[PDB]
Amino acid sequence: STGSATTTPIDSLDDAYITPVQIGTPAQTLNLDFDTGSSDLWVFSSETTASEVDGQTIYTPSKSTTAKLLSGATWSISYGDGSSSSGDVYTDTVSVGGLTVTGQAVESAKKVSSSFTEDSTIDGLLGLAFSTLNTVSPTQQKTFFDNAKASLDSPVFTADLGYHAPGTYNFGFIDTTAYTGSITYTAVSTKQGFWEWTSTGYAVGSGTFKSTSIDGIADTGTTLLYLPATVVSAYWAQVSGAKSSSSVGGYVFPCSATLPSFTFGVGSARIVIPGDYIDFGPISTGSSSCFGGIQSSAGIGINIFGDVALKAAFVVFNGATTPTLGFASK
């Protein structure tokens, strides 16, 4: 089997991407944030505290003939941005892009933090990291990908995120029309439960490439590119008037600037992030200070190749017995 679904930016900045997902019988379609940095499929639901729902579409298990309470199971998750959610668990039929899993754990939120409530466009998350990170207790549950894997034509999924445009998540096949050149594969460590890999270095603009190992994670659920302070300082030093602002919470730059590109290494291959991908616009409405898309990972404890980096590539998440990542230009 295979599946193929379009993923759409939630706003004009590409702050996140939503993908429609069918849950239950008859189908209830929710727009979920596919997150390769976490391993819970959770949804706004009929159980979510009413004051914490503001415009999201909810899952109502009582209206699904295939829903079953997973008796005794609870979940609770905290993300890198300080957001959180928790609740109870149903099993139900879940389909993505024509690919169906029966008996998927659907984590029903009883509580969500303010950042979730305030984002009316995201109806929940679909985690695509390794199932060792799943938070369901007392019986840990599998991700949608792990449950689908054995049925797929190939044990893979791909992320093809757009810049200010829709893109695609595919499951079970590699669309050879969706990228240019060849795919470079690189090793993955699953030790922390992430798609963790080592970049071979970087360049700023037309500058020379610096060969240096940068361990980090491929995380579709993180907007920006978080790298070591040395790398980030070297990038922003090439932008007149850029500075790190403790008041704003990262590097800012004059909105009048033209940003340089940023290149990262994948083995001997190179992925180029155009400068425009690194512009996250005014810090507040009407400001002439703009927020940067490359930020320091200092104090986060991991480097994160978030959407800024991933949307410059066609990315293969190879879930074979020995997992690997692949990157191609596009």
Swiss-Prot record:
It is an enzyme of class 3 (hydrolase). Keywords: Aspartyl protease, Disulfide bond, Hydrolase, Protease, Signal, Zymogen. It catalyses: Hydrolysis of proteins with specificity similar to that of pepsin A, prefers hydrophobic residues at P1 and P1', but does not cleave 14-Ala-|-Leu-15 in the B chain of insulin or Z-Glu-Tyr. Clots milk. The active site is at 35, 199. The keyword Isomerase does not apply. GO terms for biological process: proteolysis. Belongs to the peptidase A1 family. This is Endothiapepsin. It comes from Cryphonectria parasitica. The gene is EAPA. The chain holds residues 90 to 419 of 419 of the full protein.
